Amino acid sequence: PAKAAFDSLQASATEYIGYAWAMVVVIVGATIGIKLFKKFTSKAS
């Protein structure tokens, strides 16, 4: 029982890591994009 329990728990943890990574990638890309747009547009002009 411990075998299956721990294996399923690890698999679920890995999937959750995957979804979390996708979401943080999206969020971080958006925030760095807005910051870079602000900085470049402000300084270059």
Next chain:
Amino acid sequence: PAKAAFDSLQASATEYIGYAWAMVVVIVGATIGIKLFKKFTSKAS
């Protein structure tokens, strides 16, 4: 008669001790296993 009676009684008691020990070993192993699984899985996560 007392010789045989007491010897048979002691032998039967010893066998009963054996079966009882086997059963308690199984039960205690199971309960400690479930408790340890709960504790480790809860804390480690």
